[PDB]
Amino acid sequence: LGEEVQVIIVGLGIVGLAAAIECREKGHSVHAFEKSNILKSIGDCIGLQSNATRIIKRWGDGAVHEALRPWIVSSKEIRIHNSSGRLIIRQDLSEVCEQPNYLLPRSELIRVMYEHALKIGVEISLGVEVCEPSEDEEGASVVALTRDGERQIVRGDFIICSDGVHSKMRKAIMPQPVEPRPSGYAAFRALVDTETLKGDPEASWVFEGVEENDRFDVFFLSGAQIALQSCNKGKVFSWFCIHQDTRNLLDVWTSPADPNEMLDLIKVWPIGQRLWSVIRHTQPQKFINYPLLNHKPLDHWVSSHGRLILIGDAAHPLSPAAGQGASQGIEDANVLATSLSLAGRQRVSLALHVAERIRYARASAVQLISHRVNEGWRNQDWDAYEPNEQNIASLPLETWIYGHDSQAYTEQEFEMVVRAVQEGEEYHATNLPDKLRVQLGIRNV
Ligand SMILES: Cc1cc2nc3c(=O)[nH]c(=O)nc-3n(C[C@H](O)[C@H](O)[C@H](O)COP(=O)(O)OP(=O)(O)OC[C@H]3O[C@@H](n4cnc5c(N)ncnc54)[C@H](O)[C@@H]3O)c2cc1C
Numbered sequence: 001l002g003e004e005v006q007v008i009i010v011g012l013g014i015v016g017l018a019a020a021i022e023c024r025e026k027g028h029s030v031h032a033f034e035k036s037n038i039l040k041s042i043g044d045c046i047g048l049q050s051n052a053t054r055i056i057k058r059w060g061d062g063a064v065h066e067a068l069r070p071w072i073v074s075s076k077e078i079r080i081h082n083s084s085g086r087l088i089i090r091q092d093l094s095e096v097c098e099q100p101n102y103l104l105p106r107s108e109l110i111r112v113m114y115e116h117a118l119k120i121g122v123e124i125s126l127g128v129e130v131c132e133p134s135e136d137e138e139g140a141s142v143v144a145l146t147r148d149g150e151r152q153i154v155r156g157d158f159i160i161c162s163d164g165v166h167s168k169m170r171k172a173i174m175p176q177p178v179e180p181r182p183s184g185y186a187a188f189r190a191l192v193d194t195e196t197l198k199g200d201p202e203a204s205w206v207f208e209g210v211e212e213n214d215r216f217d218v219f220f221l222s223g224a225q226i227a228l229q230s231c232n233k234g235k236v237f238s239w240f241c242i243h244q245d246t247r248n249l250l251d252v253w254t255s256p257a258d259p260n261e262m263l264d265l266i267k268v269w270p271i272g273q274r275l276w277s278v279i280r281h282t283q284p285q286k287f288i289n290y291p292l293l294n295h296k297p298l299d300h301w302v303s304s305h306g307r308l309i310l311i312g313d314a315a316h317p318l319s320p321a322a323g324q325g326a327s328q329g330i331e332d333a334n335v336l337a338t339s340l341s342l343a344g345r346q347r348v349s350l351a352l353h354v355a356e357r358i359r360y361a362r363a364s365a366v367q368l369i370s371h372r373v374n375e376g377w378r379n380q381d382w383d384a385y386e387p388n389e390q391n392i393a394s395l396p397l398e399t400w401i402y403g404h405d406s407q408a409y410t411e412q413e414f415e416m417v418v419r420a421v422q423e424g425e426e427y428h429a430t431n432l433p434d435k436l437r438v439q440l441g442i443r444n445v
Contacts, residue, residue: 004029005345008142008156010130010169012038014046014106015312015329016162017113020122021059022337023160030122031154033144035129038114041107043253044191044288045231045238047073047323048109049402050099052330057100058407060116067112070232071104073097075216078394080387083221085271088387093216096397101323103214103231103238105191133159133172133308140307158307158348160336162329165251165295167314173303180293180317183374186249187290187320187393188262189240190282197237197281206278210234218392221269222383225393228278239279240320241265242292242377242393249291257289292319294371297364300445302356306349309356311336316363318370321393324401325370328363331406335359338410343418354417357427358410360445365432368440369396400433 007023009016009032016032024030048056057065076097080089102109118124125144132143140159144152161169171177197203206215206228215230215237225242243265259282266272295317301310311332318325336355343351373395380391409431420427426444428437437444 005340006156007031007158007160008140008154009033009160009162010142011161011163011167011312011314012110012114012124013162013164013312014109014113014326015333016160017110017117018055018330018333019160019162019311019336020117020124021064021113021120022333023340024117024120024122025059026337026341028340031125031156032117032122033125033128033130033142033154035127037126038110039107041105043106044189044286045103045229045236046106046109046326048102048330049096049323049327050101051402051404051406052323052327053100053102054405055330055334055407060120064112064116065100067116068102068104068109071102071108073101073103073214073231074212075214075229078216078218078389078392080218080389080392081220081271082387083219083269083271083383085219085274089389091389095399096402103229103323105236130163131168133161133169135159135303135305135307137305140305157345158309158352161308161310161314162312163314165313165317167310169308170298170310170314172308173301173310174298178296180295182246183292183294183319183377184244184246185242185292185374185377186245187240187242187292188257189288189290189320190238190286192237192239192278192281193283194235194237197278200277200281202277203281205274206230206237207234218387219271219275220382220387220391221266221271222381224265225382225391226266226275227393228275237278239282240393245289245291249289251291251293253288253290255288256285257287259284259287261289262287290320292374294374295367297360297367297442300356301360302352306352309336309352316367318367319374319393321370321373322396324366324396327402328366331404332359332363334406335410338407339414342411342414350418350421353421354414356445357417357420358406358413358429358431361429361437361442362432364442365436365440366396366401368442404431406431
């Protein structure tokens, strides 16, 4: 017959934009829907590791990577300090940053990806909340709701559910929700106002060397782990502070936290004032206190008829750390688009199920390693013990993660995964260490 493949994408965060670009560059017709005004600045910085940048580098013949070049990480080490600000450990980043990594405001990453998606012909509809997905053996559909209450049925060959950690699409796949477990920790975090930071002489130290090497400082205080970073030659500074918090906080990016809670936490220790000299230039409405919740892996990501798939934080939400949360979502988009092109238009359900088998254990392993990091904090004493790079929130920094080429793996393994899906056998993926799958309690889909 020959009609274009019709892809529906629900949610244009990082992962939905990546999926839109990957699918459109395979020639599909892509209609993406997003309920919020995503061009408005919100949040702070996102990191992307080499497993994500090697995917991004292929897009638009390298054009997106060229746009992101100012944001390539130039830190060569993490400088880890105690509560007096004395340097204890320099953790070398030369292998992690052998290939490009990015650090940049999330809103700027969104803007660059959005502009590329428009340029290549992704159809985008903002101010639309998608609900009520359905599917049968031949296609899928959703209801698109504008804010003024107009309803429209939208039909497609399959739905990519990239609607984030609070995904309402997720109830179409998993009938019952599993509530995440609070880690007992939260992260104060924000961007600093660079203009007021400049011209505060008591904060001038933070600019030292940032035009040659991005700042990447960590400080361990009793009950407080503070990271301070710069990017794009000192144009942007960001920070976070991991701390105990048992309040019933919502995991959203929209509510202003009390800056004095952060000040009280750090000002009683020797380095606190020096840290505050920079962090006090955070705009008073931009202080975020984000709870770190641990989500268990889902039983599966693909719907009964194989025409809806959860990817990104809808499927495997992690704490904002490493860059690996976002980076795993970008691998979702790449593997899914590659699977769709190897399977062909007549085998959509196969393509989605193959993508799931390739992604599931690897994504779940990154998720469970993330849990181990914040579960370790309850047994630690950051005042009594010397600072330990093993305790930093930026972990894991593992070659089997950031060195991986998800597209090449998918090409090589596609026919083997097809046989597993069609025969109903387990697929033992080798895109994570052999013993890691069994070691973490991971149950194959
Ligand atoms: C406003 C915001 C700010 C963030 N800031 C940071 C930050 O500074 N640092 C960081 O590390 N991570 C941040 N994150 C999280 C980060 O984007 C994710 O953890 C991950 O990197 C990518 O997840 P995602 O693309 O799957 O989902 P998300 O980034 O959460 O995107 C989901 C998108 O789907 C949209 N959506 C949800 N439901 C519907 C629906 N029914 N119909 C239509 N659209 C829908 C949402 O409006 C949102 O744009 C932020 C997320 C948000 C939403």
